[PDB]
Amino acid sequence: MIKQRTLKNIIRATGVGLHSGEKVYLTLKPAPVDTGIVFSRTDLDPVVEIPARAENVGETTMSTTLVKGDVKVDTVEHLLSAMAGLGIDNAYVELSASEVPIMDGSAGPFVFLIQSAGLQEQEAAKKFIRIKREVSVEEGDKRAVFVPFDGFKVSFEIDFDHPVFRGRTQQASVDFSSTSFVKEVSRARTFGFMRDIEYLRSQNLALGGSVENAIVVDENRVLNEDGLRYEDEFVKHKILDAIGDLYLLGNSLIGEFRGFKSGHALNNQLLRTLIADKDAWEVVTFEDARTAPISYMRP
Ligand SMILES: COc1ccc(-c2cc3n(c2)C(=O)N(CC[C@](C)(C(=O)NO)S(C)(=O)=O)C3)c(F)c1
Ligand SMILES: [Zn+2]
Numbered sequence: 001m002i003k004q005r006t007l008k009n010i011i012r013a014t015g016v017g018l019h020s021g022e023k024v025y026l027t028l029k030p031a032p033v034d035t036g037i038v039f040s041r042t043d044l045d046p047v048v049e050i051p052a053r054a055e056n057v058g059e060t061t062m063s064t065t066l067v068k069g070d071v072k073v074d075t076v077e078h079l080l081s082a083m084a085g086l087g088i089d090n091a092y093v094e095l096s097a098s099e100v101p102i103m104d105g106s107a108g109p110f111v112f113l114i115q116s117a118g119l120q121e122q123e124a125a126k127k128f129i130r131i132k133r134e135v136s137v138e139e140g141d142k143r144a145v146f147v148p149f150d151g152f153k154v155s156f157e158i159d160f161d162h163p164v165f166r167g168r169t170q171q172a173s174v175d176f177s178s179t180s181f182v183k184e185v186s187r188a189r190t191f192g193f194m195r196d197i198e199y200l201r202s203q204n205l206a207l208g209g210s211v212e213n214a215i216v217v218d219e220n221r222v223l224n225e226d227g228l229r230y231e232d233e234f235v236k237h238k239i240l241d242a243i244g245d246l247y248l249l250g251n252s253l254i255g256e257f258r259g260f261k262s263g264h265a266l267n268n269q270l271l272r273t274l275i276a277d278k279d280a281w282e283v284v285t286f287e288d289a290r291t292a293p294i295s296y297m298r299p
Contacts (some may be wrong), residue, residue, distance in 0.1 A: 002126045002286045004089040005299060006030040008118035013109065015101020018190065019063060019074055021208030024097040026079075028114070031090035033124040036250045037083060039066055039073040040094045052080060052093075054248045054271040060264035062205050064245050074099040077264065078190070081244035082110030085181035086119065087252065087296040089126060102213040105189035106229075107240055111182050119299040125285035128294075131255030133280035137262075137269045144262035144270040146255050146280070150293040151177040156238045156259040162193065164217050170235035177294050185243070187229045188236035191215035242267055249275075251283065254293060 011028040031038070037052035050056050050066040050073050058067025063075040079100050083091065085107065093100075103109035135146040155173040174184055192206060192214055200206045210216070215233060216223040230236050242259055245267035262270070274281060286292040 002128075002289045002292055002296070003121040004033050004124045004126050005087050005119045005121055005296075006032070006090040007088070007114065008120045008299070011113045011117045013101060013103070013113060015103050016208035016213075017074060017097065017099025018102035018105070018208050018213060019205050020097065020099045022097045022099060024095055024099060024101045026101055027092075027094035028117075029092035029094065030120060031092050033090065033122050034127075035090040035092075037080065037088070037091050037093065037247075039076065040092055041071060041073065041098070042094045043096045044071070051250075052076060052248055053250050054268060054275060057248060057268045060268050061203070062200075064248070064264045064268065072098050075102065076100055076248075077241045077244035078102070078105075078107050079110050079244070080247045081240045082107035082114060082186065084243050084247035084252070085176075085186060086111060086114050087126075088114070088119065089251075090122065102190070102208060104212070105191075105214040106237070107186040107244075111186045115182075115297075121299050125287075127251045128254050128284050128286075129249055129251045130282050130284050131253065131274075131280065132282055133277070135270065135274045135277060135280045137266055137273055139266060139269075141260075142262050142266050143258075143260035144266045145258040146253075146270065146274055147258060149256035150254070151175055151256075152253055152294050153177075153256045154239050154242055154259075155257070156235055156242060158235060158238060158261045160234075162217070163220050164222065165234075170232060170238075172232050172235045172239060174239060181243070182297075184230075185236055185240050188233050188240050189213075189215050189229065190237055190241075191217065191234055194218045246271070252294070254284065
């Protein structure tokens with residue numbers, strides 16, 4: 001029986017918001033079965049809880065932001081990427097401020113902190129959302145699709161009109177029943193361009209943004225002295241973002257995601273269109289993990 005997982009132990013990190021550049025304390029706690037993942041603004045009296053679910057996404061400009069009233073939890077995509085990759089159904093995430101800390105710009109630190117604490121299998125079937133039908137969303141040249149597939153698999157393609165890809169369109173594709181999220185995707189850092197410094201300045205964005213937590217690019221140059229973690233880092237990071245944004249469904253996907261330049265917006269649109277077309281999906285468990293179309297790392 002594929003069982004639900006929580007954290008074995010509590011996890012504490014410190015960091016800054018990429019967008020707010022604020023110091024934030026982060027705590028992840030176990031939660032009981034069918035809790036799902038709930039963010040908690042503990043710097044407010046009363047404490048303000050936003051379940052990590054598609055309906056709660058409010059802004060998707062340069063991050064996925066959870067909103068309940070005038071209250072946001074900004075930039076959830078990387079942590080939720082990590083928590084999906086390791087298969088966590090149930091957790092309380094406590095933040096002392098509006099934004100998850102960026103750490104190094106990838107999910108590496110999160111997967112490491114989580115696996116150090118270890119996971120706890122809980123005595124209840126894990127619910128899975130299976131794609132039964134193709135589901136597609138477009139807006140101009142951006143496109144995002146769910147396709148039935150016995151497994152979980154994430155394709156992504158983007159053309160940047162940017163010198164730094166030395167001409168080439170970035171593409172990649174990963175079967176997570178074949179390949180490790182931890183080795184191949186988790187270490188892929190977020191990234192930004194100096195040609196956007198004005199606009200970002202004019203939106204009060206990327207205030208915590210530096211070489212220390214992001215691949216920074218000035219025309220022909222990635223400024224990061226030590227370069228990249230993979231030749232295809234940028235596109236592997238878009239796959240990390242998609243895994244996080246997708247996990248706001250509140251259950252794991254049996255299916256294939258195909259992204260063509262899709263951002264946080266179009267990812268979230270795809271979730272909504274999907275939830276809405278109940279013909280296109282069903283919830284399933286597996287009484288025998290030995291015949292499931294996906295598996296997970298030992299807890
Ligand atoms: C000195 O000049 C600088 C210019 C720019 C930046 C800078 C760094 C970042 N920026 C801006 C930004 O918007 N980020 C988030 C990127 C996205 C939205 C993402 O990963 N979301 O999860 S992405 C890859 O999907 O498009 C990282 C910087 F730090 C310095
Ligand atoms: Zn990202």
